[PDB]
UniProtKB/Swiss-Prot annotation, chains A, B, C, D, E:
The chain crosses the membrane at residues 10-30. The gene is E. It is found in: Host endoplasmic reticulum-Golgi intermediate compartment; Host Golgi apparatus membrane. This is Envelope small membrane protein. Keywords: Apoptosis, Host Golgi apparatus, Host membrane, Membrane, Transmembrane, Transmembrane helix. Residues 31-58 are intravirion. One of its GO terms (molecular function) is identical protein binding. Belongs to the betacoronaviruses E protein family.
Amino acid sequence: ETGTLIVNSVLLFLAFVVFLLVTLAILTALRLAAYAANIVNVSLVKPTVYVYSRVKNL
Amino acid sequence: ETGTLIVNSVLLFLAFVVFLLVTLAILTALRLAAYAANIVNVSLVKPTVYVYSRVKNL
Amino acid sequence: ETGTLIVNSVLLFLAFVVFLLVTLAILTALRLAAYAANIVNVSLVKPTVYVYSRVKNL
Amino acid sequence: ETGTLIVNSVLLFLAFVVFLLVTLAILTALRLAAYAANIVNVSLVKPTVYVYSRVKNL
Amino acid sequence: ETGTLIVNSVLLFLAFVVFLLVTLAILTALRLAAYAANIVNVSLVKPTVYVYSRVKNL
């Protein structure tokens, strides 16, 4: 808190970790956790360039 | 507030207990709170290992 | 602001009254405000015990 | 920010104007923007009394 | 922060750029990122007039 504003993005990461429990309860309830597994194992090789389309706007 | 940056998570914990009133309103409206009840009673024994899948990221 | 830490929940309560315009905009667009009406008149008599399952966690 | 605690509701209004892009992309994707058009023109004359059911709770 | 309250909207823009990772995980999960791709390249030429419907409300 001593001249550190980056703590504001830290609390935002905590809101993304709990939203993972709600979002996971849906795909698992519909029976498709077998197709979502590979997504959590990091599959950002082709659609990973989506981060570059974010740098243009800001 | 004297050198305590850990208060940035106390406000986030208050943002989780409030979404509980929203998400519960959905599962109760679909008539399935009888199955979600046992989940609020702490059923983290088998899928509890999901916490270790977050320690590898940070 | 003389030691009034309990004001952190006041801003959270104001972020809850506004979110009511979002959820209402959804159920009203699906034509079911006739069933949600009685809910606004406070129907917490039977499912009101859901607050006790929150005191155990904290 | 000189004693103005009403700025906490200003940032909440900014999260609503952007949520309009999300909700509109749903009614427009399903092809029914012709029925939603008259809603943005403000048709709060009969169901406008819904703001009175909020004064009783708070 | 010296007489600048315009910083309250800067933290809101940080909450939209992070929400892009969630919503993007939805359209990509349903396999339709090929149609949403032309949307990030800015296609506001015809539905761009939607910002005029916000000037009337406020």
